[PDB]
Amino acid sequence: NDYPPVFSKRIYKGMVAPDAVKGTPITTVYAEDADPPGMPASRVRYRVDDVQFPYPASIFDVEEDSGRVVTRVNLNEEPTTIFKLVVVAFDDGEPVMSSSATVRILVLHPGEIPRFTQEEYRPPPVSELAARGTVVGVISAAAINQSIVYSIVAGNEEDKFGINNVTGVIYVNSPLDYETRTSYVLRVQADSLEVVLANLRVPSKSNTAKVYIEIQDENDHPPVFQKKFYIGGVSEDARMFASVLRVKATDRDTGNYSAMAYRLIIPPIKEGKEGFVVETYTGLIKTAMLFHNMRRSYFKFQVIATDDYGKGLSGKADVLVSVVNQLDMQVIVSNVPPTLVEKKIEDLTEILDRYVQEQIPGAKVVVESIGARRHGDAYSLEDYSKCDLTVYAIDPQTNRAIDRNELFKFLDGKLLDINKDFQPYYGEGGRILEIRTPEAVTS
Ligand SMILES: *[C@@H]1O[C@H](CO)[C@@H](O[C@@H]2O[C@H](CO)[C@@H](O)[C@H](O)[C@H]2NC(C)=O)[C@H](O)[C@H]1NC(C)=O
Ligand SMILES: *[C@@H]1O[C@H](CO)[C@@H](O[C@@H]2O[C@H](CO)[C@@H](O)[C@H](O)[C@H]2NC(C)=O)[C@H](O)[C@H]1NC(C)=O
Ligand SMILES: *[C@H]1O[C@H](CO)[C@@H](O)[C@H](O)[C@@H]1O
Ligand SMILES: *[C@H]1O[C@H](CO)[C@@H](O)[C@H](O)[C@@H]1O
Ligand SMILES: *[C@H]1O[C@H](CO)[C@@H](O)[C@H](O)[C@@H]1O
Ligand SMILES: [Ca+2]
Ligand SMILES: [Ca+2]
Ligand SMILES: [Ca+2]
Ligand SMILES: [Ca+2]
Numbered sequence: 045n046d047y048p049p050v051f052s053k054r055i056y057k058g059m060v061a062p063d064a065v066k067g068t069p070i071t072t073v074y075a076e077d078a079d080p081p082g083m084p085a086s087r088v089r090y091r092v093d094d095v096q097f098p099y100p101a102s103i104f105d106v107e108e109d110s111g112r113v114v115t116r117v118n119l120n121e122e123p124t125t126i127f128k129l130v131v132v133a134f135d136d137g138e139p140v141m142s143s144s145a146t147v148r149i150l151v152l153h154p155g156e157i158p159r160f161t162q163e164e165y166r167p168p169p170v171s172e173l174a175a176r177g178t179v180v181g182v183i184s185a186a187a188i189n190q191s192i193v194y195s196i197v198a199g200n201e202e203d204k205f206g207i208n209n210v211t212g213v214i215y216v217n218s219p220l221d222y223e224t225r226t227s228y229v230l231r232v233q234a235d236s237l238e239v240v241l242a243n244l245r246v247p248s249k250s251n252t253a254k255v256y257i258e259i260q261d262e263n264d265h266p267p268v269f270q271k272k273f274y275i276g277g278v279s280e281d282a283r284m285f286a287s288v289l290r291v292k293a294t295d296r297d298t299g300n301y302s303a304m305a306y307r308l309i310i311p312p313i314k315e316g317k318e319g320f321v322v323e324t325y326t327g328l329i330k331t332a333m334l335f336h337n338m339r340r341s342y343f344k345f346q347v348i349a350t351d352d353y354g355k356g357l358s359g360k361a362d363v364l365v366s367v368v369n370q371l372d373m374q375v376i377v378s379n380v381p382p383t384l385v386e387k388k389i390e391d392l393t394e395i396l397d398r399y400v401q402e403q404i405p406g407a408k409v410v411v412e413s414i415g416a417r418r419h420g421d422a423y424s425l426e427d428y429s430k431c432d433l434t435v436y437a438i439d440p441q442t443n444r445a446i447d448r449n450e451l452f453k454f455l456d457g458k459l460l461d462i463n464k465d466f467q468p469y470y471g472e473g474g475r476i477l478e479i480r481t482p483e484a485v486t487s
Contacts (some may be wrong), residue, residue: 045085045137051145075133085137266357275408293349306356
């Protein structure tokens with residue numbers, strides 16, 4: 045090691061507010077070492093020095109690695125004072141060599157540092173759809189006899205806004221998205237025109253303020269149903285206004301802008317019958333007629349969701365309802381009670397769906413009934429510790445049900461694998477005992 049560090053200037057210019065908070069940046073010093081790079085001999089660190097001028101060095105400091113000069117303390121000093129802070133830049137070679145340099149740090153009278161009209165700007169909210177160059181709000185700061193250069197210091201990472209550094213007006217730069225970020229807090233600074241030209245920023249309570257930008261959510265996403273295609277079934281004996289299925293649409297918008305009204309569009313049915321109705325807000329479809337002798341019939345309609353309660357955007361799904369009776373059904377006897385099965389149906393059904401689907405693409409299991417396990421003497425009597433669960437499946441290909449006996453194969457075939465998947469719903473030693481044909485059928 046045999047070069048010292050050498051400051052870029054011997055004397056450095058700096059300014060500081062008379063009240064400045066501890067850690068307020070005044071300026072940066074810089075030194076180079078001609079010893080070989082990536083080496084303790086070319087490794088430059090910065091201290092201060094108390095020898096020549098001690099008071100300056102009590103109240104000020106230099107960030108050891110960066111060379112940023114900062115206030116060491118909340119200070120209270122008289123305007124037009126001039127501190128002489130001597131910083132030393134030193135090696136880390138053997139032996140250590142160093143170099144000093146001075147920073148003439150001038151204290152301002154408060155009237156030379158601009159004061160913003162307010163400490164925090166909370167402009168009205170901004171449409172996420174607002175066009176580029178849309179005015180968000182306006183900063184303003186003054187200070188006698190000198191004109192102002194406005195700027196964003198921090199918080200505009202994503203380059204979402206810009207500022208007319210002349211008028212103090214803030215505008216949309218890139219487009220916006222409430223689905224990404226709802227809020228912004230910009231830090232704005234106002235330095236004076238002379239002082240930008242010298243390249244000394246003088247941060248203070250006075251000449252920094254914050255801007256609080258709130259993005260207004262807009263109805264920019266349309267409803268999307270859980271499923272493009274819904275598949276249900278009715279029994280021939282379904283009572284008027286029987287539950288058939290519950291549709292649901294969703295929307296990345298918040299509030300009223302994601303709140304659905306539901307309506308159907310059935311192709312005309314004879315004798316001016318509606319066939320089916322939906323509840324406008326629950327999205328629950330029901331039976332609006334009887335289906336006597338209509339087995340292997342089917343109905344294809346479509347359902348609409350419109351958000352903002354039918355004032356907004358819309359999306360659609362297609363629905364299929366197939367007619368059936370006991371001929372299409374199988375019974376699933378489980379060693380657990382009906383209240384348990386019924387409680388967990390959406391999930392159990394969803395399992396059976398997965399198993400039937402590997403045979404029949406897009407098949408849908410449908411749940412005619414759940415009750416006590418019928419047993420004994422021509423199924424006369426019932427056991428409420430076990431459960432008869434009555435099901436059927438619907439092929440979207442055919443629109444008609446699946447063969448009772450095919451349904452049996454698909455399930456009895458995979459009953460070991462199903463009973464594993466049921467384990468969590470049914471509990472320890474819970475399982476499907478058998479699958480059987482409805483008691484009515486057998487002739
Ligand atoms: C302050 O405002 C002006 C714009 O009103 C900026 O000046 C432009 O700067 C760009 C980018 O450096 C140059 O390419 C243009 O030639 C300038 N044009 C005009 C018409 O001014 C200026 O850079 C802004 N910022 C600062 C800190 O001064
Ligand atoms: C969201 O929609 C609802 C229902 O259509 C609106 O609520 C009604 O507002 C009127 C008058 O503005 C009142 O008379 C009712 O008391 C309100 N009813 C309900 C159920 O809230 C609601 O204003 C809408 N919300 C927004 C944020 O626009
Ligand atoms: C710079 O600091 C170093 C510390 O080792 C001294 O060697 C030098 O005389 C000067 O004070
Ligand atoms: C500049 O002056 C200081 C004393 O403040 C020394 O430590 C440094 O080495 C250089 O002489
Ligand atoms: C900066 O300049 C001062 C005098 O203005 C010196 O005392 C100091 O050591 C440094 O060179
Ligand atoms: Ca060196
Ligand atoms: Ca958006
Ligand atoms: Ca939105
Ligand atoms: Ca929406």
